[PDB]
Structure formats: structure tokens, C-alpha cells
């Protein structure tokens, strides 16, 4: 009697805000949403293709009505009864323009100002090709405190080639089915890759049908999945109106089901980049240290090519690693740019490209900084540590120039060593290690329950390290004897 | 200098309409004037153009319907950060 998808986002131990929908026209008289969704008078859509358009047969409301119902329907919705305002940016044939979408986003910004400051969620169940201006408009809205949620796209492709999917500050949602596997749609299916933040139910989703005011229908697509996460965001903000986007994103990530997806469905080179997360409501209206992993784009084959991974503005970058499938890399470093710490990975002169991999955390009232030492030519290698009192080591980085090679970093003698140090109230971190004589393909070590992985690293002196990265609270080192080094923290 | 951008997916391209994005901190009256400047320049070259919208509040700039012939001209306007060709978005 409970739709599988509503059960699926509901955790074991299971509680003001406005949701804007930019989509097709909606049927606001439908029993699922009546009196709770308002149709704004905004609409900016292209003409239908008249050679295939028969107005009398067409159901112009079908897509938007169903999505409003998934978000806030009284019987089948995620945030039942939630308040919604709809804007029409898609015509009867499901088509809109980047320009119309911009004008719709501007309209929302306009409303936010003259209306009583409160949390707002914007659901964008649509996609086009990568657009610089559309991504920029979304970023600008996100920095004004708006939570934007969008579909990853239905093309079984890398979501970073689409917008607004590829906008970093937007929450991008892929679709999974009742078996928690990626949805197939025709011969295609949910998009994937590093621009997808998480997945949510997106197959066989029951919801309001505009056929009639009490009618229901089942639909599939990443639109439906994004609608689930918009509902979840709405329930979270309804209980904690003060929650910021950064905090909300970290919580969505933290409370999702981990590792329920078989990654074999994704192309091989996307498996490491794609989060294995299926959305769920936090079992809680509501302290702990949240961190997430952020992969950069591939650097490219150039000998001097670099990749950059950045954190959200409210976040601190606590560590920085790098990965190359070929293994040919020159390490990584944490640099300052615009008074913000970024993670820069450097490519080897014979390499095809590297990823930079940042670890981004919410650490209130933290003052972090980087400390570097140049190469040494010593038996103890190159070393740096956090001198200042109350400053804790949260991560180590190392980059070198040549090709062939408590609270302290140790790197190769030929390499520069970089240490991330933070001062924050009650911050304590410790190191955990694990080595294996015969590296079968990867060495890992995880932080104990209650601790958060902030740094992930391999011990220097090895020739067969492809790189290292955090997966949730596990540190993963990739080899072609090797030791994985985790830095784990918490706030007492 | 000012760059031009278009959708990588050729069939989703909508040539003939462009978002002209101006450098940030550009004020509304400046975007308004830059749009009218483009129109006057294009008119002297025998081109009809239409300003469809002038943005303020999210991004500074304007939406213009015009021939792609004029892109080089538009890229030389004062305050221009970059210009993007309109393109389609689709229900998912």
C-alpha cells in the first residue's frame, strides 16, 4: 500500500519552505496538489512543432503535474502537502530554451527578494547541452542561499556534458530502480560520472496524472529522481529552516544508502568517479564532522597539464590527492587561489592525464592553512609538520619535478611536501595505516565508527602507486608492498 | 577578451538568438545602453535586431535576436565578458 520508492527513501529509524518547479504547465486542480501549489504567471516557452502537434489530443500538463505530485502530493508525495510554485519553461512537447530558463531563474531571484526570507528549493527536471551561462546563473542563485536540484539526464552519458546537471553547486540526481540499479530508459538510461551527486528512485514512480483530478500514473526518468531529492530537501529545511546548502548537501550524502548499486553498469572509467549513493531521508530532524570527496575533470595529455578540484565556499579543503590510471604523474599540491585553498594535480611528462581529488568538509570556526617544505636529499626524506599549538594535521600532499624517484608529513626526498593544518575547537585527528606485501590491486584502510576520514595517502618509496582517494570513510590506494595512510578526525 | 560559446550538440543549437553576458558589477543602465549600442551599430550595417530581454539581478547582460553575421561586432562591445548562442533544453 506504500509505493516502493517512498518506502525506499525512508530509513530504518524514522519530523515555511517553498519549492519552485520549472517545467511544463501543471494541472493545479488535481486532488494531489490542489490548494498547495500556486501557478505563477511566468511562462517562456518555444512554439511547438506544428507538423506533429495536435492540440486536442495533447496532454500539455502530463510531465509537470506528475512531478509536482511526486514532490508534494498528499497521498503519493515525498513531502506531503508541501507548498509549491510552478513556472512554465517547457512547452507541450517537453521543449524549452536556455534563454527561457535563465529568465525563469531571474524571476525566482526576483521573488526571493520581495518575499519573506525563508528557505527555497528550485527543482529543474530538465537538461540541455553544457551551457556556461546556465551554469553561471545557477551558481549565482546557489550563492544567494537557494537549493537547486536537477536531473542528471537520461542519456546514459557523462552528466558533465549537460546543464544544469554539470553545475557544481547544483544537486544533480541520477535514477535507480526498485533493485537499486541504474535505470535503463529505452536503450539509454540515467547519466553518471563525477557531476552526479547521488541517485534516487526514478523507475515506475506512481504520481498524479492530469487525465483527471483523482487519476494516477507511473513514470520513469531522472526527472522523477530529482523530484524525490527536492522533496527530501523540503522536509529537511522545513525542520531546520537555517540549514545552508553546503550543510544540506553533506547531509544528503552522509545519510544515503552506500554501495547498493552495482557499478558494472557504468563504463569502467566512470566507476571511480560516480558516487555509489541512493538518497534517503535523514532518520533525524537532527554534532559531527561531515566530509565529501570531489573529483576534478581529467587534466589532459599535455606534459604541463594540471587538474583542479575545488570545494564549496562554506567548506574547508582538508586534504588533496591525485590519481592517474597510467600511473605517470608528478603528485599534487594545495594552492591558494582567491584566498581559497584548491587541490592541484600535476601531470607527468609521459602521462595521459591526472585527476585532482579534494576532500571537502564542514568545519565551523576553523582556520586552516598549508605548510610546505622543499626536497631534501635526506635519509628521512622531506618532512613538514604543524608547528603552531592547537593546529592539527588533516592531510598531506606531495608533488615533485623529476620523473624517476604526531602531526608530521613525510614525503620522498626529491619531492616537496605539503601539510594541511587546521585550528578548530575540539578538533582531534589521528593516523591509521595498513600495508600489504602483495598489492593485489588496491590497499585500503578505514576510519573507525565515529571518526571522519579527512586525509588519504600512500607511503612514499613505491614505484607502483597509481594514486589515492577517499571513498566515504575508507582510504583507497591504487597499485598497478604498499601502505595506505588515513588521517581520521572528529570534533569532541 | 570576449569569447563565443555554443552547444556542443549540434542539433540542440538554436542559432539567431544570443545571450550577451557582461562583466560582473556592470550596472543595469550599462547593460541597457550596451544593448541599444549593439542595435544601432547593426542598423548602420543594414541589420535588423531585437532586444528580447535585459538581465539584472542574476547576471548582467541581455538577450538579442540577430544574425550570426554580427557576432564579431558584438564581441567588440564594451563590458562584454562572453556571448552564448541559445540552445534547447528538454524534459527528463
Amino acid at each position: 500500500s506504500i509505493p516502493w520508492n517512498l518506502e525506499r527513501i525512508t530509513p530504518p529509524r524514522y519530523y515555511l519552505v517553498e519549492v519552485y518547479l520549472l517545467d511544463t504547465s501543471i494541472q493545479s486542480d488535481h486532488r494531489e496538489i490542489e490548494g498547495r501549489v500556486m501557478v505563477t504567471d511566468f511562462e517562456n516557452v518555444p512554439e511547438e512543432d506544428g507538423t506533429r502537434f495536435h492540440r486536442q489530443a495533447s496532454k500539455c500538463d502530463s510531465h509537470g503535474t506528475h512531478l509536482a505530485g511526486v514532490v508534494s502530493g498528499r497521498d503519493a508525495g515525498v513531502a506531503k502537502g508541501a507548498s509549491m510554485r510552478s513556472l512554465r519553461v517547457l512547452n507541450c512537447q517537453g521543449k524549452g530554451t536556455v534563454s527561457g530558463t535563465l529568465i525563469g531563474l531571474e524571476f525566482i531571484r526576483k521573488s526571493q527578494l520581495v518575499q519573506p526570507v525563508g528557505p527555497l528549493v528550485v527543482l529543474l527536471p530538465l537538461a540541455g547541452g553544457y551551457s556556461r551561462v546556465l551554469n553561471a546563473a545557477c551558481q549565482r542563485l546557489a550563492r544567494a542561499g537557494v537549493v537547486l536540484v536537477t536531473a542528471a539526464g537520461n542519456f546514459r552519458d557523462d552528466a558533465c556534458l549537460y546543464s544544469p546537471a554539470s553545475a557544481p553547486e547544483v544537486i544533480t540526481v541520477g535514477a535507480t530502480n526498485a533493485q537499486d540499479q541504474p535505470v535503463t530508459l529505452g536503450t539509454l538510461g540515467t547519466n553518471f560520472g563525477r557531476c552526479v551527486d547521488l541517485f534516487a528512485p526514478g523507475e515506475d514512480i506512481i504520481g498524479a496524472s492530469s487525465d483527471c483530478s483523482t487519476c494516477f500514473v507511473s513514470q520513469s526518468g531522472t526527472s522523477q529522481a530529482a523530484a524525490h531529492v527536492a522533496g527530501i530537501a523540503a522536509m529537511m529545511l522545513s525542520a531546520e529552516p537555517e540549514l545552508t546548502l553546503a550543510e544540506l548537501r553533506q547531509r544528503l550524502i552522509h545519510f544515503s544508502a552506500k554501495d547498493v548499486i552495482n557499478e558494472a553498469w557504468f563504463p569502467e572509467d566512470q566507476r571511480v568517479l560516480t558516487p555509489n549513493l541512493v538518497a534517503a531521508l535523514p532518520p533525524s530532524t537532527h554534532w559531527q564532522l561531515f566530509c565529501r570527496t570531489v573529483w576534478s575533470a581529467h587534466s589532459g595529455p599535455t606534459r604541463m597539464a594540471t587538474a583542479i578540484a575545488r570545494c564549496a565556499p562554506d567548506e574547508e579543503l582538508l586534504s588533496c590527492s591525485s590519481f592517474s590510471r597510467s600511473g605517470k604523474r608528478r603528485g599534487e599540491r594545495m594552492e591558494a587561489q582567491g584566498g581559497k585553498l584548491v587541490c592541484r594535480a600535476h601531470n607527468a611528462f609521459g602521462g595521459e592525464g591526472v585527476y585532482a581529488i579534494a576532500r571537502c568538509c564542514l568545519l565551523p570556526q576553523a582556520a586552516c592553512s598549508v605548510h610546505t617544505a622543499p626536497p631534501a636529499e635526506a635519509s628521512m626524506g622531506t618532512r613538514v609538520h604543524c608547528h603552531q599549538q592547537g593546529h592539527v594535521l588533516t592531510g598531506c600532499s606531495s608533488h615533485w619535478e623529476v620523473e624517476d624517484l604526531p602531526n608530521q608529513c613525510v614525503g620522498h626526498r626529491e619531492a616537496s611536501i605539503h601539510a594541511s593544518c587546521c585550528h578548530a575547537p575540539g578538533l582531534e585527528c589521528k593516523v591509521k595505516e595498513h600495508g600489504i606485501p602483495a598489492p593485489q590491486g588496491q590497499v585500503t584502510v578505514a576510519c573507525e565508527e565515529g571518526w571522519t576520514l579527512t586525509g588519504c595517502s600512500a607511503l612514499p618509496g613505491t614505484s607502483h602507486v597509481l594514486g589515492a582517494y577517499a571513498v566515504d570513510n575508507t582510504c583507497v590506494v591504487r597499485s598497478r608492498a604498499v601502505t595506505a595512510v588515513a588521517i581520521c578526525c572528529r570534533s569532541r | 577578451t570576449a569569447t563565443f560559446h555554443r552547444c556542443a550538440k549540434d542539433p540542440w543549437r538554436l542559432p539567431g538568438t544570443y545571450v550577451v553576458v557582461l562583466k560582473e558589477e556592470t550596472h543595469l543602465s550599462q547593460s541597457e545602453r550596451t544593448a541599444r549600442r549593439l542595435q544601432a551599430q547593426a542598423a548602420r550595417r543594414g541589420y535588423l535586431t531585437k532586444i528580447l530581454h535585459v538581465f539584472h539581478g542574476l547576471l548582467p547582460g541581455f538577450l538579442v535576436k540577430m544574425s550570426g553575421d554580427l557576432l564579431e561586432l558584438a564581441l567588440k562591445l564594451p563590458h562584454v565578458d562572453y556571448i552564448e548562442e541559445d540552445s534547447s533544453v528538454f524534459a527528463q
Epitope: 511547438e48 513514470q219 520513469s220 | -
Partner: antibody, heavy 123, light 112 residues
Framework: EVQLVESGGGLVKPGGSLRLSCAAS????????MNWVRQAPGKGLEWVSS????????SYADSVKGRFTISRDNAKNSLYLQMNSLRAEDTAVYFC????????????????WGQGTMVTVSS | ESVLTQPPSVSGAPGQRVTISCTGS?????????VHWYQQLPGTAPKLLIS???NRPSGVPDRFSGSKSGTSASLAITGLQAEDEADYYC???????????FGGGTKLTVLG
């Protein structure tokens, strides 16, 4: 499993009418476009008509334009083809086939077909 | 009389490699629409063989491959097997017709 079963075929005289149905099961019908494709005995496949998931795209081959009318009923998981003013040349097996509705963003393959229903038009 | 042109027939012995071409125009294949291929065994419904120019559905052996170039596309079958005897159809959307039309079909015969 995913399944399509068309019915309604028969023998009819020139100038007459038939109504084909196609029942879908095993999948989310309301997110798929549907199509009729026909094949005269010993001949090639011929696209007849297409209708999108919300019926906002509808089109017809020239050869049936004005005589055939496609429609669908998502609540009943059904696709219809109303055939009027039938001619001998309309004699063929008629298949239905689905393709996921990408709203013209992409035109996917017809990835599942029915087994077809036979239609003969003869004096 | 079909918008897409295929050779009427092709043949090979078990083990050989054969190809089937599909040529269209600027209103379909040359307009950026993908070609999809179908196999129809004698007395059955068509089934999907290659989608999106070159993708194989689950259950289709890697002996089958497809490619597209310009206004034409090609289906290739290596290690020809007896059960490959069938008719093969290409398909592509055509923007002037507003429909996804089919080639005239190629009859493949397994010899030897």
C-alpha cells in the same frame, strides 16, 4: 517481462474500416512513445505512425495520411490504430513497437516489438 | 522506393565476414540522427540488433558491429553463423518526414 500484444486484425473489403489495438505490460507505458510498423507479405518494413507518451507528438507516413488515426490510452496501457478507407495496398502484418520518449532530444531505437496482427484488404 | 538504401541481398559461408550498407541523405543520417539495425528471422517479428550506430543490446554477440559515417552506415558480421540467415533493416529518423523510416531490407544468405 516487457510485452506488447496487438490485436484486431482481419479481412475487410476496400473502402472499409478496422481498429487495431496493442496492449502493453511489464513496463512503464506512460514514459514510452509508441509506433505502428507494417509489412506486406514478402516485403520490407514500413513505418506507419508514431505517438509520443503524452500524445504531443503525432505523425503519419504519407501513404496513410488522412485515412489512419493513431491514439493511445495510458490508463489502459493501450495503443490504437483506426484505419479508414482501406485499400488493397494496406494489406500487411501490423506491428507495434515502443521507443522511450526523450521529447525529441534523441530518437532512440524501437527496442521492443509485438508479434503483429494480420490485416487483409480484398474485394 | 525506400528513403534509406540497402543492397537487396548479401551472402557468405559460415566463418566469413560480410557487411551491409545503408545510405541516406542530409535529411536523415546526414542530419545527425543515429542509425539503428533490426534482424528479422523468417516468420518472426523484427528484433533490435544495433542501436545508436554501434551499440549492442544484451544478448547480441560481438560478432555484430555497426558504424556511421557521413550519410551512410554499415553493419558488419564476423564469424558468420547459420542462424544469422535473416533479413536486416536499417532505420533512422528523417526530419522532412517526421518519422523514423526503414531501409528496404537486406536478405542475408548463409552459403556452403
Amino acid at each position: 517481462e516487457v510485452q506488447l500484444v496487438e490485436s484486431g486484425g482481419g479481412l475487410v473489403k476496400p473502402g472499409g474500416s478496422l481498429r487495431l489495438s496493442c496492449a502493453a505490460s511489464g513496463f512503464t507505458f506512460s514514459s514510452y512513445s509508441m509506433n505502428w510498423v507494417r509489412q506486406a507479405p514478402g516485403k520490407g518494413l514500413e513505418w506507419v505512425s508514431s505517438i509520443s507518451s503524452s500524445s504531443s507528438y503525432i505523425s503519419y507516413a504519407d501513404s496513410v495520411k488522412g485515412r489512419f488515426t493513431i491514439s493511445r490510452d495510458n490508463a489502459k496501457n493501450s495503443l490504437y490504430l483506426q484505419m479508414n478507407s482501406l485499400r488493397a495496398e494496406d494489406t500487411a502484418v501490423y506491428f507495434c513497437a515502443r521507443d522511450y520518449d526523450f521529447w525529441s532530444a534523441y530518437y532512440d531505437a524501437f527496442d521492443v516489438w509485438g508479434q503483429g496482427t494480420m490485416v487483409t484488404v480484398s474485394s | 522506393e525506400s528513403v534509406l538504401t540497402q543492397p537487396p541481398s548479401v551472402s557468405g559461408a559460415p566463418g566469413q565476414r560480410v557487411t551491409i550498407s545503408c545510405t541516406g541523405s542530409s535529411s536523415n543520417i546526414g542530419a545527425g540522427y543515429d542509425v539503428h539495425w533490426y534482424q528479422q528471422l523468417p516468420g518472426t517479428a523484427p528484433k533490435l540488433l544495433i542501436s545508436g550506430n554501434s551499440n549492442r543490446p544484451s544478448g547480441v554477440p560481438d560478432r555484430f558491429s555497426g558504424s556511421k559515417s557521413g550519410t551512410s552506415a554499415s553493419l558488419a558480421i564476423t564469424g558468420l553463423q547459420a542462424e544469422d540467415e535473416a533479413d536486416y533493416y536499417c532505420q533512422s529518423y528523417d526530419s522532412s518526414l517526421s518519422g523514423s523510416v526503414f531501409g528496404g531490407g537486406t536478405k542475408l544468405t548463409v552459403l556452403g
